[PDB]
Design a protein around this ligand. Structure first.
Ligand SMILES: Cc1ncc(COP(=O)(O)O)c(CNCCCC(=O)O)c1O
Ligand SMILES: *Cc1c(COP(=O)(O)O)cnc(C)c1O
Lengths: 363, 365
């Protein structure tokens, strides 16, 4: 009975789960003799090669498959990365941003500066002033604000990293697969002429988060630091990797993304239109030109926690922007701001969801 | 025409891949609408409940699913543990042992003591001497010497840990689904009255056709430490989790374990008979009646490296004890003690494998 405006979930109904299992039988019969065993620690080479081709095609990312590392989550690869990067590196994160990564870095004993955003995303002025060593950025659709970083700002960050040795940018290209605006913008890593960027990718938005498949691409110098480790074991089963590779090479991935691009586009249009009507125009929407969510701000007498406590009662799954407040202070000011995810939201349940949303906002 | 005496986990020839895939289907059907969600960070709860019920009756492990953390393999679970334990904790490991885990700890910048064995396992003598803060131990079937630590030694370790704060015992239970003849002695943590043991288990032996599924059971203090972080995400795919749960609860698992046990019971018997037949009083089989490996000591004038070198020339794959040293600096190998691993040993390969081993142990015949 719940309706879900979650940005963390997907509808199982639009994922071709039967194709996936069919690829799995194919991968299994292809590599039956050795499915049993562990893969190369970075992941199967042929599989790393398929991905390499994919992200070069879609994101213009330039690399050799040996630079790629596959892992069971962005957060296992982020941890590893903190061990490849200089021990005394000062990290910098978007504010607001991904609270888990913030917590991960702190718990690793790192200093994390918090960089505020402007209309173009991560503030280059703040970056220069604070002087961190490594930036963590989400250029395709800033998490959670949704700002698509323009190539002008991408170049600004790439010039910053070039100006001094041992500066790195971690490019978190999370939900970069769908675009409802001018066409794609090549990843920072592709615009880079000096190998200062670590490109991170995941299959959680395109596939299903249940499937724990992610990867990252290392500059050569960090790759040699990884290989010098010797003890690392792969975290994705051999069959999972081969199933993904089969899913992609068969073209099913390409079909799935193209179908979904259209599906999300139209569902996003519907949902917004229904927000503007039900709220009479008295709602502010931001970060809606890409990705699987946007941000909505309301004029109401209620606090964010009131709306959230109430929306929970109306059986509406929804999250407050306060969830993404990195630098702490008792400072909720202005309009309550909520993130509106729509991957998990049914076509049929848009009108009801907006009405439930209205009631939770106003009473 | 290679023959391998080097495997300690099965392969796809041994695994009912079809049963697994069919359980995966059913699990997926049952839990369709929830695949679009990411798991609970400790793993799906009802999965944790299933494993817990299982391990309580097979190993005598006493715990609640609330204390269990599921992960994509033992490495990732060990990595996390080092972050839950005191930063400046000193670790200690058995020698001979799992070198990979030695490097993991060393790369994490930890002090690691190396602790020799006697005929009851990890040396309490050496432990009370070298004074570490946390022990890493394989009490059910030592890796790779095969020693089953007796309860008297388990109690000594337990008492040791209880004596000062910030002392813990990691218990690596890795192949305890296979016990031959006499029933097993339960897991060490079944004796753990003061919450000093962290139980680490895996499905790598009893199953692994590549599956990355392990789990660890935490004492409340470390569990609270874990819940304090708030940033951890499950690494084991939700599909793998539900499948295994179905595999277990459908009964398919015990049926598999029952079959494999007899199969490995046969092979160990048939292999030891053959060793005793071609060698006689010249072979000593040291090791327990458990697991997928044992230790052979040879009464020969060849050195370990000689035998290993003649072994590769006869296309027989084996390892001597010296491989399982954790550390090395200015010394080398030893004298005829090899470990035999028979998880992937064809029955047809037994006599020929034993005949090559005989050749390599003298260089004649
Ligand atoms: C900022 C950011 N980057 C990457 C990911 C993908 O993570 P996995 O590869 O799936 O482990 C995510 C995923 N996050 C959803 C959680 C959002 C929340 O509100 O907690 C992410 O956010
Ligand atoms: C196989 C094994 C493990 C478990 O490793 P996984 O990460 O579960 O594959 C742990 N300890 C020892 C000694 C082993 O041989």
């Amino acid at each position: 009975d719940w309706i879900s405006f979650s940005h963390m979930s997907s509808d199982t109904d639009h994922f071709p789960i039967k194709s996936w299992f069919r690829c799995e039988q194919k991968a299994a019969s292809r590599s039956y003799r050795t499915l049993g065993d562990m893969s190369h620690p970075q992941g199967i080479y042929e599989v790393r090669a398929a991905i390499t081709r994919l992200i070069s095609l879609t994101r213009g990312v330039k690399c050799r498959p040996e630079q790629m590392i596959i892992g069971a989550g962005t957060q296992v690869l982020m941890q590893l990365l903190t061990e490849l990067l200089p021990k005394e590196a000062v990290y910098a994160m978007e504010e607001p941003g991904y609270r888990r990564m913030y917590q991960l870095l702190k718990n690793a004993g790192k200093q994390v500066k918090t960089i505020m955003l402007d209309e173009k995303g991560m503030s280059i002025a703040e970056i220069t002033r604070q002087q961190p060593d490594v930036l963590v950025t989400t250029p395709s659709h800033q998490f959670p604000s949704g700002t698509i970083m323009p190539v002008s700002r991408r170049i600004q960050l790439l010039n910053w990293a070039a100006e001094e040795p041992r500066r790195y940018i971690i490019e978190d290209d999370y939900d970069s697969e769908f675009t409802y605006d001018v066409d794609s913008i090549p990843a920072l890593q592709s615009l880079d002429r000096f190998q200062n960027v670590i490109y991170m990718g995941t299959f959680s938005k395109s596939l299903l988060p249940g499937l724990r498949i992610s990867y990252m691409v290392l500059p050569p110098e960090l790759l040699r630091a990884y290989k010098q480790r010797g003890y690392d074991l792969q975290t994705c089963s051999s069959l999972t990797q081969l199933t993904l590779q089969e899913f992609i090479e068969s073209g099913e991935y390409q079909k799935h993304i193209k179908k979904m691009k259209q599906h999300y586009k139209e569902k996003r249009e519907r949902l917004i239109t229904a927000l503007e009507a039900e709220f009479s125009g008295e709602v502010t929407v931001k970060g809606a030109n890409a990705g699987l969510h946007f941000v909505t701000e309301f004029d109401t007498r209620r606090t964010e926690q009131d709306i959230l406590s109430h929306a929970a009662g109306l059986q509406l799954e929804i999250f407050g922007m306060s969830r993404f407040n990195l630098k702490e202070n008792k400072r909720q000011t202005g309009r309550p701001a909520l993130i509106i995810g729509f991957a998990r939201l049914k076509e049929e349940d848009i009108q009801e969801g907006v009405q439930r949303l209205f009631k939770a906002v106003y009473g």
